[PDB]
Write a protein that binds this ligand. Structure first.
Ligand SMILES: CCCCCCCCCCCCCCCCCC(=O)OC[C@H](COP(=O)(O)OC[C@H](N)C(=O)O)OC(=O)CCCCCCCCCCCCCCCCC
Ligand SMILES: CCCCCCCCCCCCCCCCCC(=O)OC[C@H](COP(=O)(O)OC[C@H](N)C(=O)O)OC(=O)CCCCCCCCCCCCCCCCC
Ligand SMILES: CCCCCCCC/C=C\CCCCCCCC(=O)O[C@@H](COC(=O)CCCCCCCCCCCCCCC)COP(=O)([O-])OCC[N+](C)(C)C
Ligand SMILES: CCCCCCCCCCCCCCCCCCCC(=O)O[C@H](COC(=O)CCCCCCCCCCCCCC)COP(=O)(O)OCCN
Ligand SMILES: Nc1ncnc2c1ncn2[C@@H]1O[C@H](COP(=O)(O)OP(=O)(O)OP(=O)(O)O)[C@@H](O)[C@H]1O
Ligand SMILES: Nc1ncnc2c1ncn2[C@@H]1O[C@H](COP(=O)(O)OP(=O)(O)OP(=O)(O)O)[C@@H](O)[C@H]1O
Lengths: 50, 292, 259, 148, 360
């Protein structure tokens, strides 16, 4: 369950961020997006199952 | 079992605290997943009704005024200057207004445009967004290159089989890089353009325009680059405006746009000066006074 | 897993013990009169032999603005660092002293920016006075850059924050050196990376006012054409040695160091 | 303190980069601290198991020792499981670092991408890299399931 | 182990820059701390006191400060502990004497009628409270009983005398009379006889006069001296503009109290535009006299922050001349009505007077 959740959530996250207006990127600090893409993804990948 | 309750309680609470924090991360991930924006589709039949590939880019500007929030302040104020098909157009307008107005009209990137803005004659709203930008060229100021095979970098989307990609990287600019590339066409760029040139992306954009039939062209200011680069760009624009019949320049180095067929200039919210020839540019000493 | 943690700790201690006994900048009795006073200056970078700088014979007391110039990789940055005392010394008499050591200002060819507020990145843990601050930033032409930065002086400059470009980094680095209010200043190629005449001379003019007021040295190591010669003292070097640090008349007689 | 008194020779400081020394302060010191956390274990868990074994024989007899010996003889297999788990995790974590670097470079010049319509190529490439990391993560999930 | 304990000690990862987190710290809800509350009871918390038992040395004074419920409990515990302790002593001495096991024998009890511990407890009650039922006498047999009887009587008299003293000092308490002294909730700054002054109203509710009233007044502002001193709470004294300068006052009807803002006042540079809530100023009033019944001195404390002040308003007249005698209509005690006043400072008014008066 944990592994399947990680896979589908990651591809949904990639699809959403890729198809987003460029003005949103320039307006968002881009540290929040990076944090929730790198650190938060790690936590859901290797911690939430166990 | 009463002996084991003593640590089951503790570890239940500890695991609950850890689960709370980890699910907070999931909430933030899902919150970014709730940005339901960037509608990409076509609100019209795009097979034949719009232009299959833009050729002339006749700007019949119908009082197109762009403001991103549409509430704070406008970026354009009824910017209506017809394009010059069959000839270059060097518009050294101020970055305050001209840059934002041109990008919104040409790319539909800033969707909130009061009225309508059409490139290639037909409306830009009635074509797929990715397709609309897939048949147009553009260059930028800040160099942004990744690491990968150059033959897989020039035309990655179409996976072109043309061996002319190496010719573009050997003739248009950076000839010595071919000898400096141990692989050649298939060679993988090093660390996203480490010590190649400031305008390696210029060669890539030229290759894309030559491949994707990108008749129209967009130019941006050069932060710092050898004058030979602007001379090669001018020659490429002459090629692009004698064959593809359209090329648009945007910068604040006026002498770059001085040698051009047409000229425009923007100030404090919208376009302030327009002229089909460049004779009025020298006649209206305002342009070159800002330069020098 | 308890035994595993013990094994991991053993690896960490092996790593830490190797690191702890590495090279040290206190070698050659580094840790136990003219400012730039060097008699022989047999410097070194390999701890046991193999020198990359020697024959250094320059005597310079205070109030002597001396621009170091030379060929590419000809002992420019090596000597600038050696003036602070980071170069291994083999056979050379040096006695730094000022009116024991002082707050020797410095910079390098490589931009170093603290992941902190831009105004902090300029003051650098020094008392915040807006008088000299405004003069230095105006001379450094960082204000036009701050006209596009959203938080301006508050953005997270450098790594772990706002990504920037080489030119902007040069402006910030030289501004930090100026504001410190030090009686010596050792620049290192503020002009090679960014070579705009107007902004460089604006900082130079501001430096003239303050430095000369305190009679503070400014060793503008560079190869900029305009002030390649100067009415102030100069020094030139090549292949890890310096010819003579004095008037330009000897340079003209050499018929080889002229523009 | 030994950072302050450290020379910057290219022979020495050109090898131990800032990333290396940052890893030392983070990884080495945290796992050394965890050793000091678990130091009483290696001085007690021996006595814990010894006393447990002794009076477990006294309570029931020989079959209790046989059951306890099953646990003792399964310790080598579970040590291997933990070892393989950590090894697979580090391989997956270095692979994730590579993928994260690619996504940083992707979301850094997004304007230059979308204006050139380079969204599809980079999105597909990241997905392929995710597939590789996911096969490695599948091994990790297998090993941790065995652990539980 | 049910807890999530595994092989992950490294915790090595790179996190991007994080800024502007959502947290309840946008604004500071807490206002400026009041130096003394409106009901006295100063809101100052001592800290880092190096205790040396001085709090516990004066038990008597400590007992007075206790509430009546806790005083009753300690009163009860003191008597009960003495009664029960000596009950054990009487029981034990009789038990040791052997006169506790009943029988028709040669033994003559030292304390008659002691059969169980219950009778010993009742006998202890009788002796110390001097009830003296006399069914459980003290005989001549064992001299130790006579000694213990003397000790118990002396201890009982001492404890009775001590508790009497404490109750006499607690029934003379006038901390519940000082709470009937009334100060207007908000004070005003308004002109009188051409000079600005800081008016105020203080009144007495009960009919028992307070003798020798004395209205002090202090201004509490942080002070930076020209020499650079840092006094977090400097207290400057304030006059009362009384006809004789002294602080004495005779209070029957609610009087108006005002500090004439002369050239030597610390209010001398205050403007209404700088009388917002977050202004570091406070006016304390101290009304201390001797209550005529108990003879015990009392204080009444009130404070006026910046926001409590009301510029340019005058108190409503309260006293009237009715048929038999004067009347005091306390419903108008705190009502303020605006008066035409300048918005200039005290020193601005002085400058205006300095020029306007010197016409020639
Ligand atoms: C807790 C008991 C401690 C004392 C036990 C017996 C000690 C006998 C003392 C005889 C004198 C010889 C040595 C002197 C010791 C002095 C003790 C003393 O003063 O402390 C008593 C305390 C606190 O006072 P202080 O601040 O220390 O006094 C000033 C001190 N000299 C100074 O250094 O500046 O004073 C107080 O703060 C009040 C204490 C009153 C204690 C009463 C207890 C309740 C009794 C109720 C039941 C009666 C029991 C009857 C039994 C009879 C059996 C026959
Ligand atoms: C914010 C509080 C925090 C908590 C701290 C205290 C905890 C108290 C709990 C609250 C409920 C208390 C209800 C008690 C009801 C019985 C006592 C009783 O009637 O005296 C109540 C009153 C005193 O009240 P007060 O408001 O405290 O006094 C006002 C003053 N400002 C002050 O506090 O001072 O008393 C008087 O006004 C004096 C009258 C004395 C007359 C009593 C005679 C008989 C007393 C009983 C003796 C027999 C006990 C039997 C014990 C048997 C044991 C075996
Ligand atoms: C509210 C209270 C009032 C009394 C309530 C009555 C309840 C108890 C009644 C009772 O039997 O008392 C007992 C309390 O004796 C003990 O239990 C002794 C305990 C010693 C410690 C006492 C201090 C605490 C009496 O026990 P005794 O004095 O040992 O009995 C005498 C022996 N004889 C009857 C054989 C002669
Ligand atoms: C160590 C090596 C193993 C030795 C085995 C025998 C040790 C136990 C001795 C018995 C003992 O201590 O008595 C126990 C008292 O509880 C306790 O041991 C409580 C100790 C005090 C706790 C506080 C009750 O056990 P028992 O004497 O009824 O055991 C019957 C055995 N046949
Ligand atoms: N950081 C260093 N540590 C040790 N030796 C060095 C270092 N940098 C340079 N050297 C040695 O000293 C020689 C002279 O270096 P120098 O100080 O002139 O360099 P530089 O001023 O940084 O060069 P450039 O002109 O490229 O900016 C080099 O050729 C090399 O052999
Ligand atoms: N925290 C405190 N609590 C109670 N009394 C204090 C405290 N601090 C100081 N005092 C009292 O103040 C006086 C001296 O204070 P201070 O701390 O300046 O000197 P000191 O070194 O404590 O003096 P001494 O040797 O006389 O005790 C003494 O009477 C001491 O009891």
């Amino acid at each position: 369950t944990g592994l399947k959740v990680a896979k589908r959530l990651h591809r949904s996250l990639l699809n959403r961020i890729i198809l987003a207006p460029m003005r949103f990127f320039e307006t968002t600090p881009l540290g929040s997006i990076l944090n929730r893409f790198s650190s938060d993804c790690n936590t859901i990948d290797q911690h939430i199952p166990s | 079992y009463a002996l084991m309750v003593s640590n089951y309680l503790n570890w239940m609470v500890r695991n609950l605290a850890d689960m709370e924090i980890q699910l907070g991360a999931v909430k933030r991930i899902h919150a970014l997943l709730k940005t339901e924006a960037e509608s990409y589709e076509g609100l019209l039949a795009p097979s034949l009704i719009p232009k299959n590939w833009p050729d002339q880019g006749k700007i019949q500007i119908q009082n197109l005024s762009v403001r991103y929030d549409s509430s704070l302040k406008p970026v354009l104020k009824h910017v209506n200057t017809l394009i010059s098909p069959g000839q270059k157009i060097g518009i050294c307008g101020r970055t305050g207004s001209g840059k934002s107005s041109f990008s919104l009209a040409f790319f539909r990137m800033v969707d909130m445009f009061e009225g309508r803005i059409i490139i290639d004659g037909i409306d830009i709203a009635k074509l797929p967004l990715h397709t609309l930008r897939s048949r147009l060229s553009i260059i930028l100021q800040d160099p942004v290159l990744f690491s990968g095979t150059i033959r897989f970098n020039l035309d990655p989307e179409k996976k072109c089989s043309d061996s002319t990609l190496w010719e573009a990287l050997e003739i248009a600019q950076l000839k010595l890089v071919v000898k400096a590339l141990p692989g050649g066409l298939d060679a993988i760029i090093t660390e996203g353009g480490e010590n190649f040139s400031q305008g390696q992306r210029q060669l890539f954009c030229l290759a894309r325009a030559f491949v994707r039939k990108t008749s129209i062209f967009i130019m941006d200011e050069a932060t710092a680059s050898i004058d030979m680069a602007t001379e090669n760009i001018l020659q490429k624009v002459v090629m692009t405006a004698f064959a593809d019949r359209t090329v648009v320049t945007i910068a604040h180095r006026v002498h770059t746009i001085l040698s051009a067929d047409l000229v425009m200039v923007l100030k404090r919210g919208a376009i302030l000066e327009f002229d089909k020839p460049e004779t009025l540019l020298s006649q209206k000493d305002s342009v070159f006074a800002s330069f020098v | 897993s308890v035994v595993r943690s013990t094994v991991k700790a053993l690896v960490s201690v092996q790593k830490l013990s190797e690191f702890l006994s590495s090279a040290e900048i206190r070698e050659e009795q580094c840790a136990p009169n003219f400012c730039v006073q060097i008699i022989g200056g047999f410097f070194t970078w390999t701890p046991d032999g193999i020198p990359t700088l020697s024959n250094i014979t320059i005597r310079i007391p205070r109030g002597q603005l001396t621009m170091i110039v030379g060929q590419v990789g000809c002992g420019k940055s090596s000597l600038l660092l050696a003036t602070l005392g980071e170069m291994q010394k083999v056979s050379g008499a040096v006695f730094w002293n000022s009116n024991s050591r002082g707050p020797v200002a410095y910079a390098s060819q490589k931009p170093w920016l603290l992941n902190a507020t831009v105004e902090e990145n300029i003051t650098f843990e020094s008392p915040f006075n807006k008088q000299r601050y405004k003069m230095v930033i105006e001379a450094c032409s960082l204000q036009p850059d701050i006209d596009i930065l959203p938080h301006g002086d508050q953005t997270q400059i450098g790594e772990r924050g706002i990504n920037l470009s080489g030119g902007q980094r040069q402006r910030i680095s030289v501004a930090r050196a100026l504001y410190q209010q030090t009686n010596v200043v050792f620049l290192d190629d503020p002009f090679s990376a960014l070579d705009v005449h107007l902004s460089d001379h604006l900082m130079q003019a501001g430096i003239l006012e303050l430095l000369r007021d305190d009679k503070r040295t400014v060793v503008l190591v560079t190869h900029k054409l305009q002030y390649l010669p100067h009415a102030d003292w100069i020094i030139a070097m090549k292949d890890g040695t310096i010819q003579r640090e004095g008037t330009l008349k000897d340079f003209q007689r050499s018929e080889c160091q002229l523009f | 303190n030994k950072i302050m008194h450290m020379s910057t020779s290219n022979l020495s400081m050109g090898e131990m980069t800032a990333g290396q020394i940052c890893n030392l302060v983070a990884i080495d010191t945290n796992q050394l601290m965890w050793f000091f956390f678990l130091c009483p274990n290696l001085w007690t868990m021996p006595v814990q198991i010894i006393v447990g074994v002794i009076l477990l024989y006294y309570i029931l007899g020989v079959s209790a020792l046989i059951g306890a010996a099953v646990i003792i003889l399964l310790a080598p297999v579970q040590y291997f499981v933990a070892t393989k788990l950590s090894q697979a995790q580090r391989t997956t974590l270095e692979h994730s670092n590579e993928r994260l670097k690619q996504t940083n470079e992707m979301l850094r010049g997004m304007k230059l991408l979308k204006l050139y319509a380079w969204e599809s190529i980079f999105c597909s490439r990241v997905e392929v890299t995710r597939r590789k990391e996911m096969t490695s993560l599948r091994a990790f999930a297998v090993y941790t399931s065995i652990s539980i | 182990m049910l807890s999530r304990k595994g092989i992950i000690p490294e915790e090595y990862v790179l996190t991007r820059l994080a800024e502007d987190p959502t947290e309840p710290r946008y604004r500071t809800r807490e206002r400026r701390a009041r130096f003394v509350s409106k009901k006295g009871n100063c809101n100052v918390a001592h800290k880092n006191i190096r205790e040396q038992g001085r709090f516990l040395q004066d038990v008597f004074t400590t007992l007075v400060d206790l509430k009546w419920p806790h005083t009753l409990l300690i009163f009860t515990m003191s008597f009960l502990c003495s009664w029960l302790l000596f009950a054990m002593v009487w029981w034990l001495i009789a038990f040791a004497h052997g006169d506790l096991a009943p029988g028709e024998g040669t033994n003559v009890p030292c304390v008659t009628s002691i059969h169980s511990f219950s009778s010993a407890f009742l006998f202890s009650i009788e002796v110390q409270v001097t009830i003296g039922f006399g069914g459980r006498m003290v005989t001549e047999e064992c001299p130790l009983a006579i000694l213990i009887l003397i000790v118990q009587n002396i201890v009982g008299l001492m404890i009775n005398a001590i508790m009497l003293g404490c109750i006499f000092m607690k029934t003379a308490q006038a901390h519940r009379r000082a709470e009937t002294l009334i100060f207007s909730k908000h004070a005003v700054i308004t002109l009188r006889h051409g000079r600005l002054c800081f008016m105020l109203r203080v009144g007495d509710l009960r009919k028992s006069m307070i003798i020798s009233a004395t209205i002090h007044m202090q201004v509490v502002r942080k002070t930076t001296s020209p020499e650079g001193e840092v006094v977090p709470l400097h207290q400057v004294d304030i006059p009362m503009e009384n006809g004789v300068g002294g602080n004495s006052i005779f209070l029957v009807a609610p009087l108006i109290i005002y500090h004439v803002i002369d050239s030597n006042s610390p209010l001398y540079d205050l403007a209404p535009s700088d009388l917002h809530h977050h202004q570091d100023l406070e006016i304390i009033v101290i009304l201390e006299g001797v209550v005529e019944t108990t003879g015990i001195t009392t204080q009444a404390r009130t404070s006026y922050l910046a926001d409590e002040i009301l510029w340019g308003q005058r108190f409503v007249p309260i006293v009237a001349e009715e048929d038999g005698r004067y009347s005091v209509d306390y419903s108008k005690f705190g009502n303020t009505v605006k008066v035409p006043t300048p918005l200039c400072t005290a020193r601005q008014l002085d400058e205006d007077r300095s020029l306007l008066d010197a016409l020639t």
